[PDB]
Design a binder for this molecule. Sequence first.
Ligand code: CLA
Ligand code: CLA
Ligand code: CLA
Ligand code: CLA
Ligand code: CLA
Ligand code: CLA
Ligand SMILES: CC1=C(/C=C/C(C)=C/C=C/C(C)=C/C=C/C=C(C)/C=C/C=C(C)/C=C/C2=C(C)CCCC2(C)C)C(C)(C)CCC1
Ligand SMILES: CC1=C(/C=C/C(C)=C/C=C/C(C)=C/C=C/C=C(C)/C=C/C=C(C)/C=C/C2=C(C)CCCC2(C)C)C(C)(C)CCC1
Ligand SMILES: CC1=C(C/C=C(\C)CCC[C@H](C)CCC[C@H](C)CCCC(C)C)C(=O)c2ccccc2C1=O
Lengths: 107, 107, 733, 165, 41, 107, 143
Amino acid sequence: IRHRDAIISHLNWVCIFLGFHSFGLYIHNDTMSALGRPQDMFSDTAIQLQPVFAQWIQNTHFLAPQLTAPNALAATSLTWGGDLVAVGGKVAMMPISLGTSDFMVHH
Amino acid sequence: WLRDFLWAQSSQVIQSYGSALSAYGLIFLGAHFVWAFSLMFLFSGRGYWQELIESIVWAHNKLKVAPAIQPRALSITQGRAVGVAHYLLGGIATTWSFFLARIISVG
Amino acid sequence: ATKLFPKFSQGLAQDPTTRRIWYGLAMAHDFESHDGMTEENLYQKIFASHFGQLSIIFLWTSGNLFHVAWQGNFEQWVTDPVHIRPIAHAIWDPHFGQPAVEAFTRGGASGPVNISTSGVYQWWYTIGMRTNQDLYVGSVFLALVSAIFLFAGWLHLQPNFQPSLSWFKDAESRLNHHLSGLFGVSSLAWTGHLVHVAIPESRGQHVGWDNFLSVLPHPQGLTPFFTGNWAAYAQSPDTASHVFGTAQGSGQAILTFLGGFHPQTQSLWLTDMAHHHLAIAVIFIVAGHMYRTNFGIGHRMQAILEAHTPPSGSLGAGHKGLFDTVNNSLHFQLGLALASVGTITSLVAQHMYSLPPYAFQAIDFTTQAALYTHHQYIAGFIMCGAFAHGAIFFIRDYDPEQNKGNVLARMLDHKEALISHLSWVSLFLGFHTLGLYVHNDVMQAFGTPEKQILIEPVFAQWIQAAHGKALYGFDFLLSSKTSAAFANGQSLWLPGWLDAINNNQNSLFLTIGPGDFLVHHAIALGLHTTTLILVKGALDARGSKLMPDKKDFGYSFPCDGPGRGGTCDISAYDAFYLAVFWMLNTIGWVTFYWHWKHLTLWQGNVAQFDESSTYLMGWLRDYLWLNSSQLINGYNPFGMNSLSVWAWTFLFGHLIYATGFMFLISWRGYWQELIETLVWAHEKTPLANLVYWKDKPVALSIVQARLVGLAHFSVGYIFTYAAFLIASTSGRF
Amino acid sequence: DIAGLTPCSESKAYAKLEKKELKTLEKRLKQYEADSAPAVALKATMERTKARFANYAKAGLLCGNDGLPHLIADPGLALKYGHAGEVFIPTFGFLYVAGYIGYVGRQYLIAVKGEAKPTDKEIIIDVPLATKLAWQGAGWPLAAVQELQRGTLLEKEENITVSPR
Amino acid sequence: MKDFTTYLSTAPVIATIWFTFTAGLLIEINRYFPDPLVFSF
Amino acid sequence: THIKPSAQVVWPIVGQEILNGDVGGGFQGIQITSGFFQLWRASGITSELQLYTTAIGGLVMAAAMFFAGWFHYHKAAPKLEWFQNVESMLNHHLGGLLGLGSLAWAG
Amino acid sequence: WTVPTLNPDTPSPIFGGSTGGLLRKAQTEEFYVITWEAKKEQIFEMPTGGAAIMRQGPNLLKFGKKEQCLALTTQLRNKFKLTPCFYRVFPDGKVQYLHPADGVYPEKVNAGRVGANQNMRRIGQNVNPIKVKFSGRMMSPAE
Ligand code: CLA
Ligand code: CLA
Ligand code: CLA
Ligand code: CLA
Ligand code: CLA
Ligand code: CLA
Ligand SMILES: CC1=C(/C=C/C(C)=C/C=C/C(C)=C/C=C/C=C(C)/C=C/C=C(C)/C=C/C2=C(C)CCCC2(C)C)C(C)(C)CCC1
Ligand SMILES: CC1=C(/C=C/C(C)=C/C=C/C(C)=C/C=C/C=C(C)/C=C/C=C(C)/C=C/C2=C(C)CCCC2(C)C)C(C)(C)CCC1
Ligand SMILES: CC1=C(C/C=C(\C)CCC[C@H](C)CCC[C@H](C)CCCC(C)C)C(=O)c2ccccc2C1=O
């Protein structure tokens, strides 16, 4: 309670910073796509904002039965990587690939 | 998100009339209604509604049907609570109907 | 300490916060609240501001003309107006990518351009303009007129040209001159233009300042006029084979009463409009000779008003003491003027789509839609302002002692009855319209559309059949080929009128059904609830049971505190702010109805509206969702087209609307504490406490919050629907 | 032949809609066996559909180009062409019941106004009194007219008003 | 059980009972007289 | 893999028997989204009789809970010092509620 | 009774510091000082957020707002039954005694304070705004 001003000021700042660098990315991309400049967007093709930390964690959990969980036969989820499980012709679960859109929406 | 998610995936909830998913279209529309109805309580204040209520209480007193439990407008706090409750209900039920009508059809 | 900017308020100049800037921006034109304001200085500043508004209007028209002439395709559009799109102005946006430079190259232009949804091309083509030099000269002339009005506004603020307070309060002379000259002689001069320029230019003959004294408007020049043989001016009208702008099937008449539409342009006859403005000019000139001026004849409005006291005391004192009330209150005058102007703006909107006055209008569908939506939203705003200023009158200007027992006090006397009956009509219309729509939605949901409540609008259909629509079989007045009303018009407008109203490809008295019934009752609910909110804010403006001393607090004020149960949104300003939402919804219903009816008419699929407008999933599915496809595909991962700007503007309006939600739901007190924390943060941040504010940051006031939220709301509403309307009409047509 | 509306017995779009609904129902019915619970349900639904169409065409309802029954609100057109049961008769049918409700509630309010705590007789309903008044409110129109003619339905200027009247 | 029947006479309980009654009456009317678009009987 | 889970049947009253959709299994009802079928198959139910008896047990336990509320308020209500035994409450809720519960489900 | 002069040698409650205290306003225009005599060392709530220990004897406290000082005043009077008085201090060094301006608290009478802003009419007896129109500044009929 005695330093609530600092807490709330820094929370306000991070909220504004995140709002800008998350939603203004969408606005920049909308403006560029409307202006006819898809090469200037934050896309997986033009300006890649790749979530490399989440991708690394994905790859690390996928390769866990090999090094860091050797008594497990497979990874906890197929979302980390690997092949799909199809039941009745439909996909039960399959690897989820994270890209620029996933970066933007996670932020 | 507007075109390829909201507008595209709404084709199952708005075309559900005459199906077993018609209740989902009905609740889609009704949740839209409740959501917009929340905006009468959120955008407004108690002082307009108390004056309207007293002008109506005049008409009830004229015909001798003025209740003994005096009609009041909802408190400011209650106005806000009703507004947010109807907002949450409308939005969440709209998403509920949209999601279920979409994914029961396509999945 | 004391600042300089709000020169008109010392209390705002001494305000150390950011509220000073905002309130000086928003109290600038409330001249009555200015420090050291005299009534005479008030009226004089109003006069000067009116001159400035006129100058701005004429400059705006000059700019429209100039850009259509310079960057437009007016000289090519007059050649093929059905096929060529009108250019509004060119685009020079350095943010454009080459795909956008390619996509906005429309209308036969050399580069990126904007397509005019304004209708000014059809208008200027109808009134005789054919070249870009005509528009250039018109723009120069209107810029000169704007400069002249600016100079007049400066001049009539100078000491020996500042008019007295009574000169503004001279109502009889102003009315005489504004009916006779401003309305009447102006219409006579417009008739002169149509007779001398527009009609000959529609007959292929070029008439300009170079030759208009050398060409006759009629082969029998002024002999039929001075001899009373006025029908000689209607002998040879334009044929049905007439092609606009040419001499093929010309006709020699200048004053007709043909009625209906020019068949090639699907527009009103120019000779009909000339005769219209001639008749209206005569009528207004004789109307402007009614009131008493320095010549001993005429009426005094005070006498007329004080004489109109019914016996039986049914209106009490009647209109006694009302001349003083109207003449001394600028808000009464302003409310009357806004009421009338908004009503006639709605009239313009309703008549220009049914009776398109301009050539090759009604085939420019985007133009029709834009004009209707434009003028109807303008009218809704003006009509909200009418009641707003009526409330401001009741608070600031109304004297209950000088209006002792007249109709105006008799209003406040039974205001609870008025408000409760408007409440009943709103409640009934809402209950039953929504209930029938929901019943029909549930019936279409259960796959049983034959159980819908489809009430045939037989009253409006009876009216339509009285005008000659033979689709219903009422055979009453003009649909009855044996009536006297029908017989007496056959030498007159009625052939054209009945050929035009029975043509189901125009918008003259469209065929209506149960969907029209339901949406007209929704429109009625909207009108009744909007005027309920506005009337209730105007009549409870001087006090209520919750706040009996409200007149002492002004028109706008935040609240009266959380006491007495809570007084949020208590003022008349708050009633206006609440009524603007309901007005926007009313006009949204109106323009939705218009646009869908006309989109199904233009597509040759009226059955779509007739079958889907009885339930609201048809409105959502077949109007909002179906017509949004091209709009939202204005830009996609596979490129963009000229609808990219309307897609962007769509999302823009949505964003502004939602931001307004921020100011409407979230209120001041959260933001003041947040701003206090931010103040602390700035004062304690190194390298940034070097920079300090001069105005202390504070959250927006409560009234200002409501204003800003309503402004974001309305701007988003308007931009969203304009984007959707233009993109759904311009995407197909 | 009122507003270009054809009777639903003579309209072809009406029969088209009937056969369309029945085709939907029988295309659902083809999936099940002879007498299943779903088959019974769908056969009952088909019978209800045919009965509904027959009963709407029998009631002299007018249909549009879409084959849907349209109601005639106007008295004079409803009474001239036999469409009074659409909007005109149910109008008074409703108004009877609505005045019933209002008159019963009014009488309850007036009866509990006399008690020492009239407010606690409104959150806690006097059920015997309410049922007495609900039963004797069947003659609400006559009683309301006779209360209107005595000047006892309305209150005089004892109602409260704001300061500018 | 005077207090219990006083509870049952409360506004919410009486409202629940009365609206269950009204809704059941309408539901039974619509079961035995299905699809009543117009007054023809 | 072909039958849509449904556990709610609608009465045919106002035309709402259209919501009783063709979900499969010679059945007409509302396709549920609760996952109860998969949960029951994971528990190894394989019969409607077991679900019925679980329902009866649940009603018995609801009566037990309401009796316990009445008992622990009106008949033998715990003192404040009993609620403030947070150490014992945590010991029992970890070992018994979650430990014995997880052990019983494991069994 | 006469106006007491603020003794600056008064100690302050035991407080570990906050972020809700004085800002540049104290350096620029004005701040506020509240003094009270405590019978024993007691923990009270700071209006700035946080708990402080008032010392046995006289206690001085600085605040940047009058509402803070009167909030602490009402807390000390209602939860501790003390008798605080606070001042307005300017960066000039000028001290203006504020709260018990008469010596007694304003909820009680002292027989010698003059009434101000007392309209001798009813609130429904105010004139209409059309009577006070064009009064120079924008005014209410209550004046
Ligand atoms: C205000 C708008 C409105 C209106 C006018 C209607 C009107 C109607 N609806 Mg729709 N509906 C609405 C809103 C509305 N609804 C909404 C909001 C919904 C969604 C919840 C629905 C959903 C809906 C469905 C799903 C259905 C209807 C149906 C109907 C019809 C009912 C006929 C009926 O029950 O006969 C009742 C006949 C009577 C005579 C009852 C009158 C009441 C009493 C009994 C009369 C008094 C007699 C006597 C004096 C009593 C003595 C005392 C007693 C205690 C013994 C009618 C056309 C049904 C239909 O078939 O439509 C075609 C139908 O299936 N509606
Ligand atoms: C679309 C609607 C909308 C928008 C844009 C905002 C925007 C904001 N809200 Mg609000 N809010 C809204 C609706 C909205 N709100 C509603 C409906 C509610 C419910 C009542 C609230 C309730 C609410 C609360 C309670 C709080 C906020 C907060 C915030 C801020 C956090 C994000 C931020 O600063 O990032 C940066 C700004 C944005 C993301 C906004 C969009 C800006 C983009 C990037 C464009 C930039 C334009 C660029 C400068 C060009 C300028 C052009 C020039 C010509 C002027 C921001 C000012 C919080 C806050 O202020 O603390 C941080 C907060 O505490 N809002
Ligand atoms: C013949 C003499 C005469 C004339 C021409 C005018 C003309 C005018 N006066 Mg003046 N005035 C006069 C005598 C006159 N007055 C006298 C004698 C007095 C003192 C007793 C005054 C005192 C006075 C005051 C105090 C003020 C004016 C103002 C005005 C202006 C009104 C605003 C305007 O332009 O809208 C004119 C608009 C129209 C004519 C359009 C309305 C008519 C139709 C019905 C509208 C619908 C159809 C539409 C025209 C179709 C358009 C289609 C297409 C062209 C778009 C106008 C220029 C005001 C102003 O602006 O100050 C500069 C103002 O404040 N006058
Ligand atoms: C002939 C027209 C007319 C005239 C002369 C007046 C004159 C006046 N009005 Mg009235 N009024 C009018 C029309 C008119 N109004 C209409 C049509 C409405 C309804 C919309 C109102 C509603 C209204 C209210 C509710 C109030 C007034 C008030 C006033 C007074 C001062 C207003 C002020 O300070 O301006 C300052 C105005 C502004 C700073 C403008 C605000 C911004 C608006 C919302 C437009 C923003 C557009 C935005 C920039 C677009 C962005 C788009 C972009 C992003 C693409 C003044 C006497 C006030 C008054 O008298 O107080 C007692 C008052 O409370 N008027
Ligand atoms: C969809 C949104 C919406 C809706 C439905 C309404 C509805 C209404 N508004 Mg508006 N209003 C809105 C948004 C909305 N408002 C917004 C955004 C604002 C800006 C703040 C306002 C500002 C405003 C003002 C200032 C005024 C109104 C008024 C009214 C009433 C007008 C009378 C009427 O139509 O009665 C018909 C009623 C309805 C359509 C709503 C009821 C819905 C059904 C019929 C009721 C039963 C449903 C169901 C059985 C309930 C189940 C409950 C439970 C069992 C779960 C009505 C309650 C006026 C008013 O109250 O005076 C009469 C008035 O003066 N409103
Ligand atoms: C018939 C048995 C019975 C009786 C006569 C009483 C009598 C009393 N109890 Mg006890 N009680 C009982 C059973 C009983 N209780 C049970 C079974 C429980 C366990 C839950 C309790 C728990 C309990 C507590 C914790 C309290 C009481 C209190 C009281 C007193 C007044 C309660 C009141 O106003 O009731 C009227 C209240 C109701 C009828 C509300 C019942 C709500 C139920 C439990 C939930 C229903 C939710 C529903 C499904 C939601 C639907 C939503 C809708 C939209 C569909 C009174 C001495 C209170 C007191 O102050 O005593 C001195 C008190 O604090 N009782
Ligand atoms: C608040 C106020 C105000 C304002 C108000 C308002 C705003 C109002 C409005 C109003 C309005 C807005 C109105 C309207 C009206 C309308 C009318 C009144 C109409 C009429 C019509 C008629 C009469 C018709 C006739 C006919 C027909 C039917 C058709 C054909 C032709 C003929 C002619 C036959 C003021 C300022 C005053 C002040 C006080 C307060
Ligand atoms: C689903 C459900 C149900 C049912 C349920 C059930 C049926 C349950 C059961 C449960 C159970 C049935 C449980 C059991 C348990 C058991 C246990 C928990 C055991 C334990 C053991 C132990 C712990 C041991 C220990 C030890 C050892 C190891 C050895 C020796 C020594 C000693 C003893 C120490 C109902 C109806 C309610 C309804 C709702 C839902
Ligand atoms: C609409 C509205 C109102 C008016 C809403 C009213 C007062 C509440 C209506 C609730 C129901 C309809 C009344 C309950 C009456 C009986 C309990 C119902 C039993 C009988 C029924 C069958 C009619 C406010 O008082 C208000 C206050 C503060 C901010 C916003 C608003 C606000 O938006």
